[PDB]
Amino acid sequence: HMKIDILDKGFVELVDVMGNDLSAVRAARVSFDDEERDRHLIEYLMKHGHETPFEHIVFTFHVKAPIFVARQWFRHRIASYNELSGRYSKLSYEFYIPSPERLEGYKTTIPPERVTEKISEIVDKAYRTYLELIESGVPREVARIVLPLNLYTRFFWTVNARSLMNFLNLRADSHAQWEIQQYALAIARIFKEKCPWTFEAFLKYAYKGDILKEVQ
Amino acid sequence: HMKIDILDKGFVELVDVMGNDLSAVRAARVSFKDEERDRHLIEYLMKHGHETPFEHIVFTFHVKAPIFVARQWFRHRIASYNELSGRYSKLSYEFYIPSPERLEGYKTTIPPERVTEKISEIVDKAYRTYLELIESGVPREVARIVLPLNLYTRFFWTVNARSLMNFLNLRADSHAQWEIQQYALAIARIFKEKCPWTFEAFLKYAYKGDILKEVQ
Amino acid sequence: HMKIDILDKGFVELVDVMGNDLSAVRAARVSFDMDEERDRHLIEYLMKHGHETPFEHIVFTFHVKAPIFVARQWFRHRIASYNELSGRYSKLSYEFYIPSPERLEGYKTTIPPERVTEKISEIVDKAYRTYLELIESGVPREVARIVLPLNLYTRFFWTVNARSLMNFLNLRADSHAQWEIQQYALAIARIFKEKCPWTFEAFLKYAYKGDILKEVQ
């Protein structure tokens, strides 16, 4: 299974896939079974906006992302989600602590290392308060509300190539938060590995973002 | 490939599938095996209305059906479709001619065999008019409008188990037209073969229709 | 109620609408927490930068009477709500779309365009008479109707938001789409322009991918 590590404790793991570039070719021509002619069709469908044949290629991912990242991701309605229940599921209680390198470019009054320290400080205080409430008898659903937005969560993502290509135009772009951009780059990498023709054609004719045309 | 013939010239063919019953188990637990425990979870998710884990099992079918059946089918929006272009495809023109046995139960002034003959008569007249217009230079998109609603079409249907179970509840039921009931029975057969635990649980706790609890 | 007649016997009628151009402004203004000129400037900004979600808050309900072959192309738009006349039970008017000889202008035909119109009328009369003969003899509606041509008129209700409506106009109000549905999309664009003038103007200026709306008034 393809697994790309993202941020300090996160990942993107490919669980399953249905079809390849030819799944889109079969659907566009409508018949159940030439390499150059088939790849030429992929480029034709892409450059002319014939997006429906690409809905026949489906992916299942296992993502471990911080809640603030998952909140931006889960806004993509044309997909299937299954996340860990904060009310009942036994979470690992891992948190995203940005490295000082995340603050490179911004001029700060305090050192970037002090920002990293202040984030660690408040997640430890919040987590200790949570355990103290849990130990005292407060139900999980009430005690968990004190936990920060950088807390790690795990989910299953079933998405078709069409909706995956929309996620890439929006999330694999400089206007999206750096944290989600990283997760989208891993999604693009897994997509390129499984559908090389559809990915290449996408970057050539349909891709609206910027970071995928700059980063290898 | 599983292929079930429906009506006089139609079929339902399984193109591809992603996952099995365990795909729904993995998605519900949020983790990438105990037969009794896994089957007990499928039954728990089904009886308590936890339907989202079943969206992680996806199917691709190749269906050949009359346009009046396709019109009823394509009303199911939570799916992916790709049909033959009536405007450009050099399609095989075949029509659904109901057998006299289709009219069994209804009291008719003319014999059921005469109904079958009258349908064949008018489809031949309509098809001959179409070819005459096509030969005379009329574009396909205009000449085709004279063809009857029993004209066979071909399409590719990508649907997840949840939306497939909604289709079964509605189309594999006596209230739906006899022609689509037949197509839904073939869908249920391919679904049972690939996801036996999910199909058994669905019939036991969620299935709202009638014909699937009567027909084997 | 706005009603635009399409083809020989069809129409597009506006049943209801929710919101206007300022509905999209109110929905966008919640993001960055906080005037006609300023609110029109926002619509144009959202449109040119691909911020499409605020436009989902403007919803329309239409009543369309179109030939089945047109409805088949329309109903492919899944991000909408539909409700059509039941062919199995509903009492249809039994009206058919007969193209005028002017529809065949441009194409070189061996037979005159007037003969094409006559041949279409000929076969719809034959099919309709066969249908009534089966209906009178006791054949159930669901079986007897299968002989009727694709040019037969149907009626439906269409509930669609401005975002999905703008996808429809992109695809159907374009030269690559069949002339029949282009006509229906032009009336949709007309009703959309009348209710959402700022959104429609911004749409043609920055987001519209088709061709006929930038040429036809």
Add this chain to the structure above:
Amino acid sequence: MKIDILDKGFVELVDVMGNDLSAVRAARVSDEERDRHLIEYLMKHGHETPFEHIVFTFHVKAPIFVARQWFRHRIASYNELSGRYSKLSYEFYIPSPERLEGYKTTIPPERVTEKISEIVDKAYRTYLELIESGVPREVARIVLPLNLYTRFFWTVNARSLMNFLNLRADSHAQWEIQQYALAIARIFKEKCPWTFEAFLKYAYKGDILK
């Protein structure tokens, strides 16, 4: 219509399209007593598509943990407060001691309320300190707790709204979202009384509304 939820939250009706007859007009394509009888017929026989023609727009102010459960309902339109570009107001959900009634706790319920206020003040002060020192909003905000209030616009049709009520206006859903769901049901009852009544009588799967 505005219904206040929890300590600082609300559900406000922005706009609505149609009423009970919008579903009647949409169904009749396929008299008060005869129209109401149709509503009950469509509901008891599972004819749900005519109800998609009644659409609502709400303005909701709810904590992030409630919004996370709400936003899982994909058959709807959402528009939320950025966070990356918006000005973070000191608005967090502090449960009252009455929220812990029923559970036996080692510390008093009033001390739980105090400990929640204590940690939100610490997290909000840390946030302002990072913001003042030059840390961008999108990075500094990650320290804020899940009880932080957010605002969003919700455009949903009656069919998807009735699915939301079957799931969220039920004892199995968290008590906080149940409260919001009761406000969604109240506004729905006021605008579509026939649809709500028939829904309660034949289609409603939950428990708290009955």
